[PDB]
Design a protein around this ligand. Structure first.
Ligand SMILES: NS(=O)(=O)c1ccccc1
Ligand SMILES: [Cl-]
Ligand SMILES: [Mg+2]
Length: 371
């Protein structure tokens, strides 16, 4: 199972699409909830994501059907369309997904932050980095729910520098636009959700702690973090989970005044990537980095929870470390880092020693040698 949150808040989940176009915002919101008696959230909600995951994997098109038979009914422990818990302003996290992922594959992170009192807006990127995503051609196509699908772009070796950079910049824009949509709803903008979902967005009016905004993402998402903080100062700190540094322009490195936290797997990282992380460091800037012992790249996404230990380990969904213990360190270190650089009046500073990598399942900085 994808773990329930460790915080005291009940967790709710809904989807938001505004506007309906390939240029709109698409997000999955995880939020502190009033009620705990709702239907659980369907983890992968459309057959077309399974198709896209199969194209991402480069497997035979029949793997789409297999993946759908195995996982098409799986849920995650968030209350679908639960009323938002009133009477409190919540800090905001914008979450960016990896290459070949989509908005629903980081519920372990999104549920755990929500259980501690954040709203999480996990964006669905329309930059063709997602396995699949969808939008509506126009108001008519939106009305009748005639979904148009967009599938992952396969790149040639020549296309990589140029297209990965064009996409990380779209990702940054999608993070800022998602932020503006949430901030406008918090004001009280009369947003009509493109999806016919029974969660009134008017709930979120005056519910965002507007000074306490952060950007978190895994992999391509980790590079999205860095690009976003460089172009949008409304974000006050970033956390890059096993960031894939390749998409970033050489210009961005010296252009991040915000606090930034690198949380790395043991077995994903390599000299080229670590050097790019080190190009982010200056004595004037706050930087922190840890490595989770025994961990793999997939430890940060929900497929680490989707199978048994033996199959998991075999497919590199799991590492030498227990997945629950792994996500636990990443989420608790994130929480203490957020409290510190957002100025939260919570108890997350109980995990400050994780920021420093002070655990037996933690390495301070990196294992990777860069000389
Ligand atoms: N590449 S990634 O972001 O690690 C990823 C994780 C889970 C599913 C698909 C992709
Ligand atoms: Cl790995
Ligand atoms: Mg900007």
């Amino acid at each position: 199972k994808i773990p329930r949150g460790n915080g005291p808040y009940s967790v709710g989940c809904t989807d938001l699409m505004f506007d309906h176009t390939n240029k709109g915002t698409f997000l999955r919101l995880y939020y502190p909830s009033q009620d705990n008696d709702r239907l659980d959230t369907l983890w992968i909600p459309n057959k077309e994501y399974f198709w896209g995951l199969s194209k991402f994997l480069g497997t035979h098109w029949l793997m789409g059907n297999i993946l759908r038979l195995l996982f098409g009914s799986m849920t995650t422990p968030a209350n679908w369309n639960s009323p938002l818990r009133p009477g409190e302003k919540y800090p905001l996290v914008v979450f960016s997904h990896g290459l070949g992922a989509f908005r629903t594959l980081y519920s372990a992170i999104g549920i755990d932050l929500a259980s501690h009192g954040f709203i999480v807006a996990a964006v669905e990127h329309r930059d063709r980095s997602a396995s699949a995503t969808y939008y509506f051609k126009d108001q008519s196509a939106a009305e009748i729910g005639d979904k148009s699908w967009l599938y992952l772009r396969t790149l040639k070796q020549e296309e990589e520098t140029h297209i990965r950079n064009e996409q990380v910049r779209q990702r940054a824009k999608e993070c800022s636009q998602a932020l503006s949509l949430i901030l406008d709803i918090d004001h009280g903008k009369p947003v009509k959700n493109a999806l016919d979902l029974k969660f009134d967005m008017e709930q979120l009016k005056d519910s965002i702690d507007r000074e306490k905004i952060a950007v978190i993402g895994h992999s391509f998402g980790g590079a999205t973090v860095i690009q976003t903080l460089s172009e949008d100062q409304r974000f006050r700190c970033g956390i890059a989970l096993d960031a894939w540094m390749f998409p970033l322009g050489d210009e961005v490195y010296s252009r991040i005044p915000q606090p930034l936290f690198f949380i790395n797997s043991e077995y994903f990282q390599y000299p080229a990537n670590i050097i790019k992380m080190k190009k982010c460091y200056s004595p004037d800037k706050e930087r922190k980095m840890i490595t989770i012992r025994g961990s793999v790249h997939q430890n940060f996404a929900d497929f680490t929870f989707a199978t048994g230990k033996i199959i998991g380990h075999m497919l590199k969904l799991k590492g030498d470390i227990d997945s629950n213990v792994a996500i636990d360190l990443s989420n608790k270190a994130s929480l203490a880092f957020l409290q510190k650089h957002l100025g939260l009046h919570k108890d997350f500073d109980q995990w400050d020693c994780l920021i420093e990598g002070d655990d037996e399942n933690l390495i301070p900085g990196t294992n990777i040698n860069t000389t």
